[PDB]
Amino acid sequence: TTFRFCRDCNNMLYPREDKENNRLLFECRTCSYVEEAGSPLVYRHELITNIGETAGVVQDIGSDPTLPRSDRECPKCHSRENVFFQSQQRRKDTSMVLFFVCLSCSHIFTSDQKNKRTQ
Amino acid sequence: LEPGHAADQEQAKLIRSAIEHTTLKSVTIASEIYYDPDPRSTVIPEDEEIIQLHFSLQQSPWLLRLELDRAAMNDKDLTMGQVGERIKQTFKNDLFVIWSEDNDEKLIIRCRVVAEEDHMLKKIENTMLENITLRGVENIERVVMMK
Amino acid sequence: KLRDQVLKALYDVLAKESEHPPQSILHTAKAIESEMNKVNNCDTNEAAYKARYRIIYSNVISKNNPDLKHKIANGDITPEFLATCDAKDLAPAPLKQKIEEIAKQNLYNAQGATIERSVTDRFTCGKCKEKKVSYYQLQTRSADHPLTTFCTCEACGNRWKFS
Ligand SMILES: [Zn+2]
Ligand SMILES: [Zn+2]
Ligand SMILES: [Zn+2]
């Protein structure tokens, strides 16, 4: 849950209650700043998480020799200069989907054929 | 298995779901905490359909939302009622508990509490996990079937 | 007695969603209350009655809303059978097929690892004397002297060793 800090004293904003009006307010507990809530959702604790992620591409990935080159045509620029690798979420279950970094426009196409991502 | 019902596939996954230590923690997806002030209409518009029922037929504003997964909830044969009836009899008649049904796009268990009540709503956040059994014997995690 | 709770639920729900059925109200609601009243058990159940019917008439406001008349019936007969099962399976749309599509995905999870190992026809077994033996190189003392070689019989269970 996106969490805001205040101005000036720059600190953690803790949610307190507005009794007389029935609404939620974040406040600083070393200063005297208080502000309204942009949402009613205060705390989230994910257990079963849906995840499947790429890498930290610096675009300089093309400038690393130890990365393999396949030969698919990139969806947009059509250059057969790809470099690929598996999902960087190195968890035990995650699958063997290859991610292709087009060395011409830095587009990221996959090998997947069951689902779809704009990620 | 019992002499007779030993070669029955489904029969096997019925006993399975009665031995495996199934906690509320096993089926839970996300445990959220909302500031819902008027306990007669939910702030969340994906819940509106729920309250209509549990009113048609004095507490506190700090709501505690729980999303259960349909998938896990049918490996170990359970239904929303059974889940909800279990929490409501752990803290008994001092935690306002409600739950959806088995035909909504998303299952939800909404409960409210009854002088720092945001700090007592986490004492109880942990009990609703590592101290609550649904159906199964304790210490028996994972139960595999084999022919 | 508390049939009012039963009363309003039907009448109100089946006629207020949309004003489109008039006066057929005093037959849809009226008819399917004694069926629940004849089963309610004025106590007995203690809510196992409520639980069903209450939660039945909430399967009526959800995403099946095209089919969430009917009501208008296909043999509204479903409610006496809404006390056993309770139909239940019968209430969703093709989200049924999803529920039973999940069913299969759960059986596959229950069964365990399958011991698959390439068998050789270059082996004699004692138990069944068959030609179906797998082994695993290793290990004790490799080379000089020699090296162990432990087989197995996936038919019979026996184990021996070479050297
Ligand atoms: Zn401040
Ligand atoms: Zn490109
Ligand atoms: Zn053998």
UniProtKB/Swiss-Prot annotation, chain A:
One of its GO terms (cellular component) is nucleolus. A zinc finger (C4-type) spans 6-31. Gene3D superfamilies: 2.20.25.10. Zn(2+) 2 binds at residues 74, 77, 102, 105. Keywords: DNA damage, DNA repair, DNA-directed RNA polymerase, Metal-binding, Nucleus, Phosphoprotein, Transcription, Zinc, Zinc-finger. Zn(2+) 1 binds at residues 6, 9, 28, 31. Its main location: nucleus. It is found in: Nucleus, Nucleolus. The modification Phosphoserine is found at residue 39. One of its GO terms (biological process) is maintenance of transcriptional fidelity during transcription elongation by RNA polymerase II. InterPro entries: DNA-dir_RNA_pol-M_15_CS, Rpa12/Rpb9/Rpc10/TFS, Zn_ribbon_RPB9, Zn_ribbon_RPB9_C, Znf_TFIIS. GO terms for molecular function: DNA-directed RNA polymerase activity; nucleic acid binding; zinc ion binding. Coiled coil: none annotated. A zinc finger (TFIIS-type) spans 70-110. Belongs to the archaeal RpoM/eukaryotic RPA12/RPB9/RPC11 RNA polymerase family. Present with 2440 molecules/cell in log phase SD medium. DNA-dependent RNA polymerase catalyzes the transcription of DNA into RNA using the four ribonucleoside triphosphates as substrates. Component of RNA polymerase II which synthesizes mRNA precursors and many functional non-coding RNAs. Pol II is the central component of the basal RNA polymerase II transcription machinery. It is composed of mobile elements that move relative to each other. RPB9 is part of the upper jaw surrounding the central large cleft and thought to grab the incoming DNA template. Involved in the regulation of transcription elongation. Component of the RNA polymerase II (Pol II) complex consisting of 12 subunits. This is DNA-directed RNA polymerase II subunit RPB9. The lineage of its organism: Eukaryota, Fungi, Dikarya, Ascomycota, Saccharomycotina. The gene is RPB9.
From Swiss-Prot, chain B:
This is DNA-directed RNA polymerase II subunit RPB1. DNA-dependent RNA polymerase catalyzes the transcription of DNA into RNA using the four ribonucleoside triphosphates as substrates. Largest and catalytic component of RNA polymerase II which synthesizes mRNA precursors and many functional non-coding RNAs. Forms the polymerase active center together with the second largest subunit. Pol II is the central component of the basal RNA polymerase II transcription machinery. During a transcription cycle, Pol II, general transcription factors and the Mediator complex assemble as the preinitiation complex (PIC) at the promoter. The lineage of its organism: Eukaryota, Fungi, Dikarya, Ascomycota, Saccharomycotina. The tandem 7 residues repeats in the C-terminal domain (CTD) can be highly phosphorylated. The phosphorylation activates Pol II. Phosphorylation occurs mainly at residues 'Ser-2' and 'Ser-5' of the heptapeptide repeat. The phosphorylated form of Pol II appears to carry, on average, one phosphate per repeat. The phosphorylation state is believed to result from the balanced action of site-specific CTD kinases and phosphatases, and a 'CTD code' that specifies the position of Pol II within the transcription cycle has been proposed. Belongs to the RNA polymerase beta' chain family. It is found in: Nucleus. The C-terminal domain (CTD) serves as a platform for assembly of factors that regulate transcription initiation, elongation, termination and mRNA processing. It comes from Saccharomyces cerevisiae (strain ATCC 204508 / S288c) (Baker's yeast).
Curated annotation (Swiss-Prot), chain C:
It is found in: Nucleus. Zn(2+) binds at residues 125, 128, 153, 156. One of its GO terms (molecular function) is RNA polymerase II complex binding. One of its GO terms (cellular component) is nucleus. Residues 2-118 form the TFIIS central domain. GO terms for biological process: maintenance of transcriptional fidelity during transcription elongation by RNA polymerase II; positive regulation of RNA polymerase II transcription preinitiation complex assembly; positive regulation of transcription elongation by RNA polymerase II; regulation of mRNA 3'-end processing; regulation of transcription by RNA polymerase II; transcription antitermination; transcription by RNA polymerase III; transcription elongation by RNA polymerase I. A zinc finger (TFIIS-type) spans 121-158. Belongs to the TFS-II family. S-II binds to RNA-polymerase II in the absence of transcription. Necessary for efficient RNA polymerase II transcription elongation past template-encoded arresting sites. The arresting sites in DNA have the property of trapping a certain fraction of elongating RNA polymerases that pass through, resulting in locked ternary complexes. Cleavage of the nascent transcript by S-II allows the resumption of elongation from the new 3'-terminus. This is Transcription elongation factor S-II. The chain holds residues 147 to 304 of 309 of the full protein.
